[PDB]
Design a protein around this nucleic acid. Structure first.
Ligand SMILES: CC(=O)OCC[N+](C)(C)C
Ligand SMILES: CC(=O)OCC[N+](C)(C)C
Lengths: 275, 275
DNA sequence: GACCCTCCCCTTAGGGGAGGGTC
DNA sequence: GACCCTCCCCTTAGGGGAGGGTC
């Protein structure tokens, strides 16, 4: 007996003719006979048994050369191979569900931002804690901070989270500033999203957090005239209420879009904790 | 401002020069300036912000054209995109953990086989239940059964499990046969491995099982002289003990290897239930 | 007519060269 | 010397043709 044409076989095993032809090319699964005159491929019924494995292995996802060597193994030998495949699967799963969580949180963070009570206005609210990696900003003012200034931070973040946080942060001493050049950042930082142990972290990186507590905040969209005014707004709010400050000012800058085809726009949030 | 060479940027963002050049080719991320004389690529510090997304999206796994259109979205628009990515992740996870289970079981099944008390000898043992898909074998004897005879079964199996079961089964009426040609199969079947609802199953397929209970069994490696003798061995074992049979004889044939480079060998197991 | 053939271009996201300027 | 350039071949597992026999 009983001989199948490539088509017959295709229908039979549910494998594309192109597939079979290919698996012939790579000598993974060759027809039992090839008519020398017409180059036609013809297969034996007993032969189909091999596709059982080729197909299974394909479903798992093992690459073809891999199959080519796996098909040699005797049952004992193979069992092992299968346990290997298992661990690889669990690796993926671990990675994927990590990825599931981070996103959920990226969305949670991204949402609080799209639902902020109002812009250019100062609001006081109960905040949740936010872990971050920070580093001394060596006499670095909002005047000359660079993206390049964040690179090492972004490295450790990238390794741990895998997912470069949109957010850029810096903090400074809450003072009755009168102009931007009096301002200098104390540390700069990037919120961390993950609990994977950071690998091989250097000692110039403090892992620390923006504690939970009451924050006087303000959020707006960036425009230079506006930046210092909003600051002033905050200092005023606090001054009027007599409220007592207990942290630096936290500044967070997050893009609204990443289109290089449109004018770049950013969101800014200054937070500060009170009693 | 402050201008970076492709190298500077590479080091800075941890992205390969080849990557950047490519992302330039596809107009996903182009340098701010290209020296017309030396075709050198040069980038602005403010520009790096875009790789934040490109890199994140890459980690998730979204394809490049995809990114190209995602980078246009404003925050609201994007949030949605992220929820999309989420569901896709959960799809994968579901699939993967299904795959995790099936393998564990493929291994469990494969193991009982490598640890069978002895060959060509009849053993009586307490068996666990085994679900299967079967179908009337229309006057089909062990004499002329084909692999092609199993194709539809293998289809439904493939769809549900995704993983073509190694095992081939057939059953027949327990009789004091005297020769192979008196033997005809009643049904033929393939063990099922999964609980995914079988899709659109036809009515000529019975989903049914090999019940748990006590089985007189025998297992050996295929050789024609041996096949009928082993059968006879079984009939004798039962005859001597007077034991009372309550099912067909179940025959299972499973290859020991799938190498086309070696002589094909199979394992056979005849089981039968008693009281 | 329906089924098979070989050979060619096609996709992804670059890596690793070789061959040649340019900092 | 170290850094950048363009252009070319390379990988995976085939799918979708066009152009031509052959069942
Ligand atoms: C995003 C950007 O414009 O630069 C990052 C510095 N920061 C935090 C002052 C805004
Ligand atoms: C695997 C093989 O030789 O054919 C399948 C039929 N059966 C069950 C009689 C062996």
């Amino acid at each position: 007996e009983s001989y199948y044409s490539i088509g017959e076989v295709s229908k039979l095993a549910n494998v594309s003719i192109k597939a079979l032809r290919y698996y012939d090319k790579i000598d993974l699964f060759k027809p039992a006979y090839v008519d020398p005159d017409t180059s036609y491929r013809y297969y034996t019924d007993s032969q189909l048994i091999h596709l059982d494995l080729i197909k299974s292995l394909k479903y798992i996802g093992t690459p073809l050369e891999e199959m080519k060597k796996a098909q040699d193994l005797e049952m004992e030998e193979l069992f092992a191979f299968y346990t290997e495949q298992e661990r690889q699967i669990r690796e993926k799963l671990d990675f994927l569900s990590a990825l599931e969580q981070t996103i959920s949180l990226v969305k949670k963070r991204m949402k609080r931002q799209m639902e902020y009570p109002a812009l250019g206005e100062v609001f006081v609210l109960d905040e949740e804690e936010i872990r971050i990696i920070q580093t001394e900003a060596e006499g670095l003012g909002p005047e000359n901070v660079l993206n390049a200034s964040y690179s090492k931070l972004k490295k450790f973040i990238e390794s741990a989270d895998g997912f470069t946080n949109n957010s850029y942060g810096a903090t400074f001493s809450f003072q009755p500033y009168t102009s931007i050049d009096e301002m200098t950042y104390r540390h700069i930082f990037t919120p961390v999203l993950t609990n994977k142990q950071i690998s091989s972290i250097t000692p110039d990186m403090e892992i620390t957090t923006i504690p939970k507590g009451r924050y006087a905040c303000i959020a707006y969209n960036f425009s230079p005239e506006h930046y210092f005014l909003n600051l002033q707004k905050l200092i005023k709010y606090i001054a009027d209420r007599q409220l007592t400050v207990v942290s630096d000012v936290y500044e967070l800058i997050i893009p609204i879009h990443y289109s290089p085809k449109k004018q770049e726009e950013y969101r800014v949030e200054m937070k500060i904790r009170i009693l």
